[PDB]
Amino acid sequence: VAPTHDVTTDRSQRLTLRFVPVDREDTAYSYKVRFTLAVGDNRVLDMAS
């Protein structure tokens, strides 16, 4: 019967979303990146995916 009523969202959380980078800079062998993973406001993140 696949339950409803506060199993799934009613409310348009985006199913997956592309983060954007900022403050990347180089070395002759290495490479840095940075991200702000803004999981926010009545949602979770599982971090394996």
Binding site: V1, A2, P3, T4, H5
Partner: protein, 298 residues
């Protein structure tokens, strides 16, 4: 093992889970969330199994008990062995064709009268398992309307022996008498031994009720008694007090002495229970735990 057959009809044709189509008072009991054990259990079912119960409870369905009332009859006929058990799948395949052929308002109310007297007027079947006039009272009241009541010697002890024999087949639910051939018999148990030839016993006891025999005569009755008469007097011994045949008839040499012979074994069996339990308490050969044990008791 069961008492009633319609409960098994209510066990083989009712839904085990609570449904509002048949048990509304228990299905509405849990929709409104008013229950002792696990009250809050109907909100947390989703829209699948709410509307499939909450619609069917405020307006019930209208089912047909025709298939259920006949199992309260077809079971009630096979409990009393009227039908073979290998056969009830045919008669319910024929009764359901019957009561749907000639169906009416009447027959649906006439089966319902018949699923009540196989419940509360089948108490006769509970009755003559106790009074056992299946084959013990009305099958022996033909035997007491067969024997001659005019005995020359011992007119009074003749009608006290059979007064103690009617009590024998009454206080025992298993024993029964019957008509097989031109003579009546009496077995002390179903699936049982010790069949007495009841016609060939009272004919042996006729002309015997007054002897006044002495107490120095044992091995004469091989040509006078018969061992089944000697066994019928064994089966009348525990239900015969000391006031039936008093002291000095030859049955007083038999019926009183048979109670002493039963009186030996009803305390020596307790002795025999002690001996067979002390052979493993000290350590004894179990082959030689019965040879010398019986010789001390016989």
């Amino acid at each position: 093992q069961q008492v009633d057959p319609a409960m098994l009809a209510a066990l083989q044709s009712q839904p085990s889970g609570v449904t509002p189509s048949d048990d509304w008072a228990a299905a509405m009991d849990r929709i409104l969330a008013l229950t002792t054990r696990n009250p809050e259990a109907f909100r947390q079912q989703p829209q699948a199994n709410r509307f499939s119960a909450i619609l069917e409870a405020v307006v019930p369905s209208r089912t047909n008990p025709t298939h259920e009332k006949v199992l309260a009859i077809v079971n009630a006929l096979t409990e009393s062995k009227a039908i073979r058990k290998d056969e009830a799948g045919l008669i319910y395949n024929a009764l359901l064709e019957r009561v749907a052929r000639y169906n009416s308002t009447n027959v649906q109310a006439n089966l319902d009268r018949l699923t009540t007297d196989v419940r509360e007027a089948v108490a006769q079947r509970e009755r003559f398992m106790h009074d056992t006039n299946l084959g013990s009272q009305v099958a022996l009241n033909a035997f007491l309307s067969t024997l001659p009541a005019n005995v020359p010697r011992g007119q009074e002890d003749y009608v006290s022996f059979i007064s103690a024999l009617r009590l024998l087949v009454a206080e025992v639910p298993q024993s029964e008498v019957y008509q097989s051939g031109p003579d009546y018999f009496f077995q002390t148990s179903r699936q049982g031994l010790q069949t007495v030839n009841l016609t060939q016993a009272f004919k042996n006891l006729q002309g015997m009720w007054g002897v006044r025999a002495p107490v120095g005569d044992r091995a004469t009755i091989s040509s006078l008694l018969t061992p089944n008469t000697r066994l019928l007097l064994l089966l009348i011994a525990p239900f015969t007090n000391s006031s039936t045949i008093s002291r000095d008839s030859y049955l007083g040499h038999l019926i009183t002495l048979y109670r002493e012979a039963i009186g030996q074994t009803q305390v020596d069996e307790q002795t025999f229970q002690e001996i067979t339990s002390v052979s493993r308490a000290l350590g004894q050969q179990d082959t030689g735990s019965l040879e010398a044990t019986l010789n001390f008791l016989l």
